[PDB]
Amino acid sequence: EIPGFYNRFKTQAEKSTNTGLKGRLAMPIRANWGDVGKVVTIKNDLRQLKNLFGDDMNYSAFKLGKLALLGNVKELLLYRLVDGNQKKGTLTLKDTTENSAKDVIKLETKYPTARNFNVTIKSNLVDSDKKDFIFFENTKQLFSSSIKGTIDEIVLEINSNLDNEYVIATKVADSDTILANVVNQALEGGNDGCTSITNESYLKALEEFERYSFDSFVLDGVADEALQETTKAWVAKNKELGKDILLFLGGKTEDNIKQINDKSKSFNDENIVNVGSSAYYENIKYTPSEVAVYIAALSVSKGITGSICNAKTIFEEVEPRLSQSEVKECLKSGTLVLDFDDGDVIIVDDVNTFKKYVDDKNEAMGYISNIMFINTINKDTSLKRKEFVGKIFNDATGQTTVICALKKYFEELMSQGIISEFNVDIDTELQATAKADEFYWKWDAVKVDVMKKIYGTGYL
Amino acid sequence: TGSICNAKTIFEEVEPRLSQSEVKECLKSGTLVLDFDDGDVIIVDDVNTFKKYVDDKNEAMGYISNIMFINTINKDTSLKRKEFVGKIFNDATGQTTVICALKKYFEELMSQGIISEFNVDIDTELQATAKADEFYWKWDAVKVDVMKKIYGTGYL
Amino acid sequence: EIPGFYNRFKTQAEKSTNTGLKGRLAMPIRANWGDVGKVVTIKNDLRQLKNLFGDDMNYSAFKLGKL
């Protein structure tokens, strides 16, 4: 640059930061409003969810999004599910100067929907040629504007202000004629999003979700069986492909605790978590899958350095309600069920559906926190792939560098206290059999536990 | 001193996109195809069209880096032609000088770590049959490999 | 395989082992329940015996198996 003393101030995020959030979650959702056919990330502010997908609790989108956000996920990734017939609302405007009136402007909702987004056009009381363009939803006004009677400036203004973000205006003809007055005319022709949604839509959503990486998946708070087996196979495929995705599920409200335990027996992969209990938060019930959304969100928000075995929930009630016998039955079945151990609703344990089996996949694998730990180690290691694969020569120096980097990572874990003991070394047994263009290595560790049970004995 | 089997590319998208079955099919066919192993576009492997065949032209010949190495050795050697052809007398001294120069070159390669092991010597089998105005020589080497595959096993 | 860094975790029997057992024994048995006409090996967990030959002490099978 030219000589001088040029300041560039950067008080962007000086101390406007907090560290109370973590994790990311996947969400196929049915929605009346918002983008369609894309996987969109949502920051934890619910205002973003409300803006980008509406505020209708009749739909899985807003309700499950609110539950996930209250789960304190750092970034919530959504995908709007639709049938192919799903459509945008639309309205058309016409001129009045000519006896044979001609359509000159068309209004269409910015996102596909079927809501009663309405529009009003009336004569401007100040200027003769101006028309006052006002927009509503069921007469609840969104935005008002006034432009002279030329179509180009009218559509440009209507598309300019983001107060009119609900609707897009397009020019039908290049007229300079006075528009026709409308009063609360709905943008018709749209279709909602709950229309004929089937397993194929969920399959397409999952195929879209293959692109990204996630900490957990919950399947739209829907307990349809065939979707559950499909997602089970999909997660197994993703695991075999090096994508370590965890899955939470919730049974149907009609299922008895015996049926829920049978389903939790049917699932035995460690990445499957079955939720049995229903709950109420704002005096409104939530099916086991709807609360499975929340428990998955809370789990991913916990991340490492935590668990869920007694994490307090937002729910004001829980049902069905279990004695210690029923709780033990559910845990032995691998079911996760909420509890009312105190005046609040409390998560009973960290169990997953796998826990029915014991020894080879160890008992700690029956707990979700260990699976999150293993998936995190696999993810960081598969991040190291690109640092080390195809970039170092397999000699003693390259092996030493790889081992030193992994040792530094595990020592960082040790510094956090997550691991009580570890060692990482070359797998000389397999390294002897290794081909010259490959490397084998081994590591042992001991994750630091957490009190689930405590016992006290008193003397007087 | 490098390869392409995981070199990051500048490309923001790649198509057509392949499962591991398709990738294995392409590699067995000798095809080179880009991949989206992460958020970027990444080169899958070092393979060439030859790789369909295996043993005589060895499996390392199926990889482009080995061919680049062999071509470089041939090029430097065919650079040495002008230094040695028609300029030294084929006696024991000339043969020793040629062998010493080639040994120095291969030791320079060893210093760079590209070669893990080598030996270079007169091809006494063909040198016995060699005409008086020519020279035969032999060399073995071991190019240093690179991790393409890595496997880890965990204990808790 | 294709190039990559593919983990395969093997926390099967990390430290879930003990050395308090040895030996093998033959047993012709009368039983109300279980397989017939085959020589079946039973691991020392009595639950395996109970599953594969019942839990009736009236028969040589369960009683002598427990012993």
Numbering used by the authors:
A (entry chain S): 13 to 472
B (entry chain M): 317 to 472
C (entry chain L): 13 to 79
Passage from the reporting paper:
Contraction of φCD508 in urea reduces the tail length by just 20%, whereas most CIS tails that have been described contract to ∼50% of their extended length; the outer diameter of the sheath increases from 230 to 250 Å, and the inner diameter from 78 to 94 Å, sufficient to break contacts between gp55 sheath domain I helices and the tail tube gp56. The contracted sheath retains the arrangement of gp55 subunits in a six-stranded helix, but with a decrease in helical rise from 39 Å to 32 Å, and a concomitant increase in twist from 19 to 34°. The measured 20% reduction (48 nm) in tail length is consistent with a decrease in helical rise from 39 Å to 32 Å for 57 rings of sheath protein. In helical reconstructions of the contracted tail, the tail tube cannot be resolved because of a mismatch between the helical parameters of the sheath and the tail tube. Furthermore, the X-loop blocks complete contraction of the tail for φCD508; we modeled the φCD508 sheath proteins into a more contracted conformation, based on pyocin trunk structures, but increased contraction of φCD508 sheath proteins led to steric clashes between the X-loop and the neighboring N-terminal linker, as well as domain II of a neighboring sheath.
Here, we reveal the extended and contracted atomic structures of an intact contractile-tailed phage (φCD508) that binds to and penetrates the protective S-layer of the Gram-positive human pathogen Clostridioides difficile. The virion can be divided into five distinct regions: the head, neck, tail, baseplate, and needle. Structures of purified φCD508 virions in both extended and contracted conformations were determined by single-particle EM of frozen-hydrated samples; the resolution ranged from 2.6 to 4.0 Å for the extended phage, and 2.9 to 4.2 Å for the contracted form.
